[PDB]
Design a protein around this nucleic acid. Sequence first.
RNA 1: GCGCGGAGUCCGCGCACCA
RNA 2: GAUACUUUAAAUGUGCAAACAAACCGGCCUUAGCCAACUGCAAGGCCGGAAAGAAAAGAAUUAGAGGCACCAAGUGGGCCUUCUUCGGUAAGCGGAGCAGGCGAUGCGGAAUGAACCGC
RNA 3: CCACCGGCCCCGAAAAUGGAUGACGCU
RNA 4: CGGGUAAACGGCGGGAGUAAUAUGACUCUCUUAAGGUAGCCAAAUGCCUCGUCUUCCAAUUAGAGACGCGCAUGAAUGGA
RNA 5: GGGCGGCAUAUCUGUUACACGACAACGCAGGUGUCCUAAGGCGAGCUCAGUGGGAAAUCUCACGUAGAACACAAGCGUAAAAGCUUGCUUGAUUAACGAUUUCCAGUACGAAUCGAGACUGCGAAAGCAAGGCCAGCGAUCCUUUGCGAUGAACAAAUCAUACCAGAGGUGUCAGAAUAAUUACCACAGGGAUAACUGGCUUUGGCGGCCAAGUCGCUGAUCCUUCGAUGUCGGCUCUUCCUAACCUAGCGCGACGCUAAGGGUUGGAUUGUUCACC
RNA 6: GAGUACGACCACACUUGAGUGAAAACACCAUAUCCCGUCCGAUUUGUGAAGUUAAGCACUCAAGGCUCAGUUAGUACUGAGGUCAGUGAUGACUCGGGAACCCUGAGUGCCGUACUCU
Lengths: 66, 152, 96, 252
Amino acid sequence: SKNHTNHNQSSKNHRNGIKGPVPLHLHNSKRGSWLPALVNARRVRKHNQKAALKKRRERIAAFAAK
Amino acid sequence: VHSYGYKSGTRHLFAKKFRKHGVPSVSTILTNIKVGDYVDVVADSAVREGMPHKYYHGRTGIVWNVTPRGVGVIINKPVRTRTLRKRICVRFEHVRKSRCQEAFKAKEHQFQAYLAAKKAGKALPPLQKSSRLGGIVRPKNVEVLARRVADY
Amino acid sequence: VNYPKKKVMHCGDARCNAHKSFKVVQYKAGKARLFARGKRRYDRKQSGYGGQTKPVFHKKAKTTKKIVLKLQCSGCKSIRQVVLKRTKHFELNDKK
Amino acid sequence: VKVVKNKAYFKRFQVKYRRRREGKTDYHARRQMVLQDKTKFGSPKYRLVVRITNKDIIAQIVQAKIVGDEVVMAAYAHELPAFGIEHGLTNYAAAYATGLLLARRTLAKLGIADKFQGAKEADGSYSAVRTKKDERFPFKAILDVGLARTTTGARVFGVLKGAVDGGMAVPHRPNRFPGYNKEKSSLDAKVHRDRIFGKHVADYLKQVKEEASSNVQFSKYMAAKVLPESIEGMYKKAHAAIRADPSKSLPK
RNA sequence: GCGCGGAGUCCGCGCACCA
RNA sequence: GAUACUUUAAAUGUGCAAACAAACCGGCCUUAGCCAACUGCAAGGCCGGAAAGAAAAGAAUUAGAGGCACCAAGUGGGCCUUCUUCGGUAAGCGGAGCAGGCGAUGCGGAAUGAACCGC
RNA sequence: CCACCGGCCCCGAAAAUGGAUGACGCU
RNA sequence: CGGGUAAACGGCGGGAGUAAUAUGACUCUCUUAAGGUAGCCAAAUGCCUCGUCUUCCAAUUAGAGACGCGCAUGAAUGGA
RNA sequence: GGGCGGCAUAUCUGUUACACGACAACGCAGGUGUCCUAAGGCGAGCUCAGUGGGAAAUCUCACGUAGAACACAAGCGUAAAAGCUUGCUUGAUUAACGAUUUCCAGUACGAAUCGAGACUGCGAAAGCAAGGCCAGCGAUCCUUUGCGAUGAACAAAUCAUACCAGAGGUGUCAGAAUAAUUACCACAGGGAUAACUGGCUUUGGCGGCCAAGUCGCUGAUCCUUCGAUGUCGGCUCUUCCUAACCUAGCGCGACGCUAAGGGUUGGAUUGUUCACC
RNA sequence: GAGUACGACCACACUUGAGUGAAAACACCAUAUCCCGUCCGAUUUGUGAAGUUAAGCACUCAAGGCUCAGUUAGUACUGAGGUCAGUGAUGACUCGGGAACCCUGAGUGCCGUACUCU
Ligand SMILES: [Mg+2]
Ligand SMILES: [Mg+2]
Ligand SMILES: [Mg+2]
Ligand SMILES: [Mg+2]
Ligand SMILES: [Mg+2]
Ligand SMILES: [Mg+2]
Ligand SMILES: [Mg+2]
Ligand SMILES: [Mg+2]
Ligand code: NA
């Protein structure tokens, strides 16, 4: 009454193919990483965002000048 | 069916080679591992802390996290119709630096050297020739290939 | 299993907080109250005709219990509960 | 009686490491000493190796590499004659001097000699070393003693005190110094100073001369006519000589 | 689990029973 | 060993890589990260360079458009064969591994035959 | 003229309605 | 907790071993609430079993009379 | 088949298993519901099993690659140790809802890995330690203990309740509270499944063939049939086979070859087939 | 050409038996009032320098082992194929991959940092 087999299973699994893994650059979250390095990286990223805003303002002013 | 534990059926997998027992060495201790490196996961049976499951014993992956004594590695695992990216945590005794990209790095270096020489104007090395071309063969020894009475 | 009578630890609890002695007691369940909500509900359900209205457990299989200790230190009044492995005896002495 | 080391005995035999067979290195301790946090991606770490022979003392600063250890700087107790010490090598005072000499040379090489002057005054006191693990931080190294037994008053700790007073950071507790009392859990700076300057040597030398007055120990002192009540002064002068010229070595 | 006895442990008696 | 456990060790397998969100060469900014310190190391960015866009040496090929969702059916009694096999004296017997079939399929062959040969 | 090894064929080879290289036949 | 009661429901072994070729009047042990008494039987109740002896027939796995190591007969669950 | 028996119902090791992983049978050989304040943590000193030579079990010297030990089954692992002796200890505590592995639906439970913070232990130091590596365990509701908002017209003290963390248990172990009998019997179905023929395979029969072990010619399964294929023996009647009892021929009183044309009985006891007179 | 201290790989470095050892060093060796530890200054700890290469150590030389080649051998085994041969066990063939033990030949450590001597 309790049958077990793997007979048709590989054939089923290959109809819609074995999908490849997601590339390394997507879904690259850092949650659960070693805490001190994470804390430092956050501060660096905040400074970088401030710099990006300043650079855009300078570009806008330069274009308005010429 | 009756017994399925964490280390079941690892009698020959988690064993040391003949006349090669012992513990890791200072070369293993002094190896530097960075995030983004390719590593091989090979279980060291004499440590027993932070050992991976037997499924991961021969796989290669990418480091995503370094701790004071541990490494986090990403390893592909097919399940039914897809490939999952599993994150395993191990001690540094159980990993090695992978040489899976040596040929590619060498190819880039040789390309850079060739570019430097071509811009310098230095003479280039002579390119290799094919081994499948024709030619005249001058023989030293000729024999007779035969099946003889004494052969049997 | 044997456990020591006294144990040294801090036990701050808004007082000295330094590593001092503890007084160790073994937890025992209190007596069930007649006016607990749930006891009142069961009594109201059981009154009248109909017989037993809730299941009664019969098929015991466990032979042991977990041990709970209550730890309390001088001055600092708080109590801390700690859990030990299952055992059959649990003597609470320090003879060695 | 069958032989033990037969043919099948050699085929299944695994040899130990070379230096284990020669009985020189304790690899179990060496692994823990060379180990470092993996998050510190191979930043430098230093050992102070102390090795005492029959007739000399050796002290070097070592960093471990895969190709082989490199020695940052080394000092030997056998060159102390060039500073003013003779007939009394390999004792506790010469150990103190060797440590202080190594520290002075090391700070001088690394260019931080003026900063971290050490303790110009000599005393067998205790002062916990300042470390980040707890103002510019002092140069740091951890002590390596090898197979030597770590008993109270042993000369390895005198070598250590020499460097600590020379101005190095070596983490330590004062529990193995000559003046320490275990039951009371305190240190006797007076006794430690006595052993630093070598009063016990003078007491022994007086005793042996007074006894031998009637009718081979301390033969070189007795032959060269070295007198008591000058040993402390000689050591105290040697300390200043080192702090003035840290590199003045044996001639030619 | 609650009361009695008899040598927190045990022994009997009669009672109680929603994980 | 006993009187099959094992140093050695295949064939068939199996993980990773092989230049366009990637990697290589030099400025510079930032971090209450590591280090005795930084002109070293770690991390995130900005400004530049190079680019047989991957040579030659047997030095790939493709009836080769990648990814992401939503809603829902039937099914959850299988059976036969090839090569491995465990139980059983054996079975058109029971239990498994890999692949192909019938079930759901006729047609052309083996006089005849769900599953053989060809298609 | 002997000892052994082959190829075809012949003994070894005994059941229950009359019957099957598919049938006839073929040397 | 103490008494009583089987023409109340029912029960009547665990067994062993000794003795005058045989055998056991004879002895010893184990043991129960008690240890099958008077009777009766291969019975409409006996597995082995077509038991063994006698009779009935030319010949009887059937019938009758005897015997009793009774798988598992027996006293108003009534015996003869 | 079902019942009886058992647990193959939670759970571990070696094999089955086919050099990644996965892989079954009331398959094989064995284990588990506990035990330990040390048998947990750390530092130091030391080397074990055994063998050989000595001294009115113990003392001594040499050798001794693990052949011993590590609570308990097994497999891996380990020698200035992971074993043995010893000193000090309680990291077997707490741990802001960090991340992950195994099972796997990529849910939970149990077990495990890498961490951040507190308070500590041992050590001169680097370090090591949040149990004894790997089996040793448990939802909702209810009860109960520890810790720091509500009872709606207001207020006080009791009492009840609430958020968070544990404990009391479900072994059929992802968790109803459960005894028999039917030959007086019933219903819905099943050839998914037994009792009878038939099929496969073996059995037991049964003597032959070379040589003097060898080589051949009742059971077990569950395929068909539960909107039914009438189940033993005797009587009656026909037909076929040979592995020859008689009758017919041969070769050597018995033994062998050809030959299936003709024949092969009446009764006592028993339902008997057999058996026996 | 050597030595010492720390080492990486961890027998071409190990085990057994002999011979040689310039100077430096390393080591045996002397000792026990103090620091410290034992039944025992044996081990260990402190303080020394009379003697010695006798041992340790290093080098060289002969056997078991170890390491790298050859043979064994296109053998054993094996991926793919047949309306192949054989009652069958099994076998050969066609397109590919391809061992091991035994036996035999050769050798017997090598690479770093610091300081010293002839
Ligand atoms: Mg169908
Ligand atoms: Mg077809
Ligand atoms: Mg009778
Ligand atoms: Mg009659
Ligand atoms: Mg009669
Ligand atoms: Mg912590
Ligand atoms: Mg309740
Ligand atoms: Mg059927
Ligand atoms: Na035909």
